[PDB]
């Protein structure tokens, strides 16, 4: 199971790790993807998770979008976890670089409450443009289920832990 995590709260854990490497090691029930409404896994966590599945996640996502249309910002969908997890919960946090409403970050994290345990990135952080310190704050104030956060960037991991209230 999950190892080397620092406990932030009763249910939120954090580790400086590559989420793809964590997923291959643990093979959790749910790995969260930092998705966009079109499930186009181009960069950041999405591009990295997709590449680890040999593009199977993108082929599956294209079929999902053809059948159901795009997701909403703040929404999610459960698809296969392929070689990384039992399932992948594709969650759409607001992308500030696309002018999306940062207020939707709480709705995005609420999707985690439908799963007892998850391996996840900080939503809307990285290329999504939001402040990761604010994303961690929304995470601990919204998620009630067991969330194991993987933070790729070492300097950011240290800043998140050191500034955690």
Cα dihedral across residues 17, 20, 26, 30: positive or negative:
positive
Q: What is the 3-state secondary structure (H, E, C) of 93-160?
A: CCCHHHCCCHHHHHHHHHHHHHCCEEEECCCCCHHHCCCHHHHHHHHHHHCCCEEEEEECCHHHHHHH
> What residues pair up with 32 in beta bridges, in sequence order?
89
Q: Is residue 118 a contact partner of residue 145, using CB atoms and an 8 Å limit?
A: yes
For the chain, give every domain's residue range: 1-165
CA distance 6 to 107: 25
How was this structure determined? It was done by X-ray
Of residues 88, 164, 140, the one with CA closest to residue 119: 88
Yes or no: say if 94 and 101 are a contact pair by the CB < 8 Å rule: yes
Distance (Å, rounded) from C-alpha 139 to C-alpha 91? Answer: 13
Please report the resolution in angstroms.
1.2
């Amino acid at each position: 199971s999950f190892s080397g995590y620092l406990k932030l709260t009763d249910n939120v854990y954090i580790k400086n790790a590559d989420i793809v490497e964590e997923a291959k090691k643990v093979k959790p029930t749910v790995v969260v993807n930092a998705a966009n409404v079109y499930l186009k896994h181009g960069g950041g966590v999405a591009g990295a998770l997709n590449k680890a599945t040999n593009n199977a996640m993108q082929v599956e996502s294209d079929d999902y979008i053809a059948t159901n249309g795009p997701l909403k910002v703040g929404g999610s969908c459960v698809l296969s976890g392929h070689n990384l997890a039992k399932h992948c919960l594709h969650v759409v946090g607001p992308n500030v670089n696309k002018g999306e409403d940062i207020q939707l970050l709480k709705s995005a994290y609420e999707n985690f409450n439908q799963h007892e345990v998850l391996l996840a990135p900080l939503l809307s952080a990285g290329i999504f443009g939001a402040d990761p310190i604010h994303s961690l704050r929304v995470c601990v104030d919204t998620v009630r289920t067991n969330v194991y956060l993987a933070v790729f960037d070492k300097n950011l991991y240290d800043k998140l832990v050191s500034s955690f209230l």
